[PDB]
Design a protein around this ligand. Structure first.
Ligand SMILES: Cc1cn([C@H]2C[C@H](O)[C@@H](COP(=O)(O)OP(=O)(O)O[C@H]3O[C@H](C)[C@H](O)[C@H](N)[C@H]3O)O2)c(=O)[nH]c1=O
Ligand SMILES: Cc1cn([C@H]2C[C@H](O)[C@@H](COP(=O)(O)OP(=O)(O)O[C@H]3O[C@H](C)[C@H](O)[C@H](N)[C@H]3O)O2)c(=O)[nH]c1=O
Ligand SMILES: Nc1nc(=O)c2c([nH]1)NC[C@@H](CNc1ccc(C(=O)N[C@@H](CCC(=O)O)C(=O)O)cc1)N2C=O
Ligand SMILES: Nc1nc(=O)c2c([nH]1)NC[C@@H](CNc1ccc(C(=O)N[C@@H](CCC(=O)O)C(=O)O)cc1)N2C=O
Ligand SMILES: [Cl-]
Ligand SMILES: [Cl-]
Lengths: 273, 274
């Protein structure tokens, strides 16, 4: 087989830390190639750059076209931005870690969609890549709570952490082609595309307190946007069991007090800016 | 105490059958009043008419304003259409059976909302009425499956059946005032108003087969409406485990074959099929 054993394709700390773990434990630089996402700027920001780590560690940056004909290569997507077509590849060893508890929440924006749909838990799922979006057979899953006042940003940093851990847990069996998998069910399968989510959320206040709270915190991801109430950005929502009456809305300098149709207290904290 | 011991307010098979049960087992006609819903024409149709049953059985028809001052009355809403204010009422014996597994799916259209939100089960919940919509303390609940090919209509007939049953199961304790209840949680609570549901549903096909199928079947309730695909009304959707390829969409004389982003076979039957 080839000098090249593995391609890491993707971004952010899950890709960089999983590549570092490969380089330290399994494969040398000359055995690895990397495909960064289109938007990788080659510098560290609020996540580390895959492109930078690869270049710093003498790992070649390649395109998809450059790896299709490499026999037996392991292709591993860690937040990769391109939909692949399996028949382009000689190898069938194609894997992804998806940031949801599949079969739920296929597609994109998976730090927003579980919260917006009232879930109490999410997960990370290692699966085979097939020609659909997050549809391939499941190899391993780790489910974890969405705590009641977690935001989309908090959820995303949990995916990063648990995704890195499920990679480390399973990578030796992927290298040895000794893993087991199971086809996904039709029932419970759900999917959201970019068009399904308006990133400038307009809150429906004719909803339960849990729903209004979930609407707010699903959009709290400051690196991208914060939800806005009367022209103030909200940085945190806090839901309590305290009944304060139905349909409360009051604005204060630093926060809003809100309740929905069931009357439980929400404190929506304004960004201190 | 007053002559009148109980009011049955509301409509359909659950109101009529529960009233019939009360009359057979607990109370006489001259101890009962009814408030039908505003739309009750007194005609048995695909549901029985509470107005007709009361007239046929010599049970007085009343307004809310006529029972507010009645001491100790049991007020039972069985699909009643009016939001009451509890302070209007001398009595605190105010009960509803809600067609969902509370705390989820408060509000309206509850034969549509759980299917549209991808649930595998629903339920009926007996609770105290408080000033909010379906927010009062839960007395009893029975959960049951939404079978994979059930329509909104099929789910409504299960609410009527399990609702009548939970009424019969609990009425002794309401009559003796010995029942127990528990406040609803804030978490998992959800609510839909009339405005949240467009009854002329436009299907989003960039979804999984389970989601496309739920979109179709949640709107199948023929006395009201049927979903329309390519200018054809749909009477049934059937979701299979069979993979047929991603994003299939083919129109035939009597049905559509459809799959979503995960490729599982849906058969959407046209109303015109013989
Ligand atoms: C772009 C963007 C993201 N976010 C949040 C929610 C997203 O879930 C989270 C991560 O955004 P993202 O674009 O990195 O990823 P997601 O949209 O979560 O995941 C998709 O895109 C990745 C690049 C992969 O292709 C993955 N297979 C896809 O599911 O950041 C915003 O809140 N506003 C935004 O404008
Ligand atoms: C009116 C209407 C109803 N439906 C279906 C879905 C509904 O869940 C089901 C029953 O309709 P409905 O109007 O009788 O009842 P729902 O909307 O289910 O229940 C509300 O209205 C009742 C009269 C009570 O006030 C109850 N407390 C409310 O939750 O029929 C339609 O599909 N299209 C429609 O246009
Ligand atoms: N075939 C394949 N299956 C996958 O499960 C998979 C890959 N490739 N490659 C890596 C990654 C890519 N994930 C994604 C997910 C969505 C979009 C995307 O652009 N979605 C568009 C809809 C595209 C369409 O309808 O064709 C959107 O607007 O949401 C891109 C990459 N991945 C698994 O993570
Ligand atoms: N106080 C009270 N609580 C209840 O839970 C209850 C009652 N009354 N009365 C009987 C019945 C009434 N159920 C309902 C539910 C919704 C609407 C309704 O018209 N909803 C409007 C929004 C109402 C609003 O915003 O104030 C809508 O457009 O959906 C009417 C009656 N019921 C429980 O079953
Ligand atoms: Cl990206
Ligand atoms: Cl090969």
């Amino acid at each position: 087989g080839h000098m090249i054993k593995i391609c890491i394709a993707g971004k952010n700390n899950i890709a960089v830390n999983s590549l570092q773990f490969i380089l330290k434990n399994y494969f040398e630089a000359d055995q690895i190639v990397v495909i960064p996402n289109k938007n990788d700027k080659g510098i560290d920001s609020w996540q580390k750059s895959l492109l930078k780590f690869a270049l710093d560690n003498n790992i070649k940056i390649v395109t998809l076209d450059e790896i299709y004909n490499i026999e037996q290569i392991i292709f591993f997507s860690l937040e990769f931005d391109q939909i692949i077509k399996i028949e382009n590849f000689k190898s069938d060893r194609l894997f992804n870690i998806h940031f949801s508890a599949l079969p739920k929440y296929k597609g994109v924006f998976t730090s927003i969609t579980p919260i917006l749909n009232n879930e109490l838990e999410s997960g990370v799922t290692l699966h085979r890549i097939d020609n659909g979006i997050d549809t391939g057979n499941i190899i391993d899953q780790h489910c974890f709570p969405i705590d009641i006042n977690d935001t989309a940003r908090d959820l995303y940093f949990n995916y990063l952490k648990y995704g890195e851990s499920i990679f480390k847990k399973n990578i030796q069996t992927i290298i040895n082609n000794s893993y087991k998998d199971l086809k996904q069910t039709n029932i419970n399968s759900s999917y959201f595309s970019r068009k399904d989510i308006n990133l400038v959320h307009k809150i429906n206040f004719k909803k339960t307190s849990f729903e209004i709270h979930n609407q707010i915190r699903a959009f709290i991801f400051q690196e991208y946007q914060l939800p806005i109430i009367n022209n103030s950005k909200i940085i945190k929502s806090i839901l309590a069991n305290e009944f304060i009456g139905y349909n409360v809305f009051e604005e204060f300098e630093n926060y809003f007090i809100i309740s929905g149709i069931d009357g439980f207290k929400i404190i929506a904290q304004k960004l201190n800016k």
